[PDB]
Amino acid sequence: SVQTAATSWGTVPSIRVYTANNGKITERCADGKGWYTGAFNEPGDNVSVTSWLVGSAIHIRVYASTGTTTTEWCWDGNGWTKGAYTA
Amino acid sequence: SSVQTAATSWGTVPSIRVYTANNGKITERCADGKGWYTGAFNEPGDNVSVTSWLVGSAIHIRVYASTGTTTTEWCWDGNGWTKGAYTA
Amino acid sequence: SVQTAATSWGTVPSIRVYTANNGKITERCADGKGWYTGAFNEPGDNVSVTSWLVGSAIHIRVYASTGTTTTEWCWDGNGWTKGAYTA
Ligand SMILES: CO[C@@H]1O[C@@H](C)[C@@H](O)[C@@H](O)[C@@H]1O
Ligand SMILES: CO[C@@H]1O[C@@H](C)[C@@H](O)[C@@H](O)[C@@H]1O
Numbered sequence: 001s002v003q004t005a006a007t008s009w010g011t012v013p014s015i016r017v018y019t020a021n022n023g024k025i026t027e028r029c030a031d032g033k034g035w036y037t038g039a040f041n042e043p044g045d046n047v048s049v050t051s052w053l054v055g056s057a058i059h060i061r062v063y064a065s066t067g068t069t070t071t072e073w074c075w076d077g078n079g080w081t082k083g084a085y086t087a
Numbered sequence: 088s089s090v091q092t093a094a095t096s097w098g099t100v101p102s103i104r105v106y107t108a109n110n111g112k113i114t115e116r117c118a119d120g121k122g123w124y125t126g127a128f129n130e131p132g133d134n135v136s137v138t139s140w141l142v143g144s145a146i147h148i149r150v151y152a153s154t155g156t157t158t159t160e161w162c163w164d165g166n167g168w169t170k171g172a173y174t175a
Numbered sequence: 176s177v178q179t180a181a182t183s184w185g186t187v188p189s190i191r192v193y194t195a196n197n198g199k200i201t202e203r204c205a206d207g208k209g210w211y212t213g214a215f216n217e218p219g220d221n222v223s224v225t226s227w228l229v230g231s232a233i234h235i236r237v238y239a240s241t242g243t244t245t246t247e248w249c250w251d252g253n254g255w256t257k258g259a260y261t262a
């Protein structure tokens with residue numbers, strides 16, 4: 001099957017669901033209305049996620065695994081960038 | 088090969104929910120500050136993820152159950168498990 | 176492919192990433208000044224994690240699965256101990 005990971009924040013709430021499918025991770029988003037496709041699109045067969053609020057600003061870390069290599073992807077409001085995580 | 092689990096918790100007691108995908112079936116184990124018991128959640132799936140949030144003292148849980156390329160969202164809001172609006 | 180589970184707490188933040196690799200689950204840690212190897216080391220092919228704060232004290236529960244047997248490991252400030260979880 002496809003593999004998913006989920007995070008949420010606040011009380012509305014905001015939800016982000018990540019799906020690993022055919023070597024690619026994509027993102028679906030809800031913020032109190034309908035679902036929409038998120039900006040996140042990077043390779044992976046396995047995915048985990050965690051998020052935290054710095055005041056009103058959400059920060060997301062997505063851990064994308066292909067073989068024995070896990071790449072950390074960072075959302076800090078402006079774009080998805082590679083993090084310094086190593087195994 | 089092995090079962091696949093997802094976990095969420097809330098408050099300081101705490102309350103914990105663990106979801107296990109086992110040979111195409113997802114079941115739920117629960118702790119609320121005593122022992123473990125089997126929860127009301129039972130739906131098909133080979134893969135499960137979960138998130139939860141509090142509105143005051145009221146827990147809201149979203150479980151994402153996947154079979155092949157089809158992900159179904161299940162919603163706990165205090166009364167029972169309902170299918171959610173999630174699509175992909 | 177390796178399988179990961181991620182949790183975070185606070186606003187720095189603190190992040191823990193658990194990786195199941197060839198029947199071994201290991202832990203990588205970030206507390207605001209780089210990644211280091213954590214004290215968690217247990218057998219398993221699948222891992223999930225949840226954590227919560229009681230005031231300023233962090234508690235972690237890691238669910239490690241081999242076949243159909245899931246073992247819960249507990250961090251409560253001092254060390255990793257066997258939890259009461261069964262299925
Ligand atoms: C506003 O942008 C949306 O929300 C952010 C928190 C991220 O999840 C991003 O990928 C998504 O497209
Ligand atoms: C500032 O560093 C960035 O954010 C931290 C919270 C970590 O996710 C780290 O790997 C990443 O490079």
Ligand SMILES: CO[C@@H]1O[C@@H](C)[C@@H](O)[C@@H](O)[C@@H]1O
Pocket residue numbers: 104115117125126127128146148163
């Ligand atoms: C009160 O009901 C128990 O706790 C709820 C929060 C849900 O996890 C439900 O499946 C479980 O049976």
Ligand SMILES: CO[C@@H]1O[C@@H](C)[C@@H](O)[C@@H](O)[C@@H]1O
Pocket residue numbers: 012013015030149160162170171172173
């Ligand atoms: C009220 O709507 C329900 O809860 C939202 C937070 C979303 O999970 C949505 O898909 C679901 O149908």
Ligand SMILES: CO[C@@H]1O[C@@H](C)[C@@H](O)[C@@H](O)[C@@H]1O
Pocket residue numbers: 191202204212213214215233250
């Ligand atoms: C202080 O010790 C570090 O942080 C704890 C919260 C645990 O993740 C432990 O395994 C790790 O070595």
Ligand SMILES: CO[C@@H]1O[C@@H](C)[C@@H](O)[C@@H](O)[C@@H]1O
Pocket residue numbers: 100101103118236247249257258259260
């Ligand atoms: C106090 O009991 C310990 O912590 C609880 C929150 C549960 O994780 C339980 O399985 C564990 O034995």
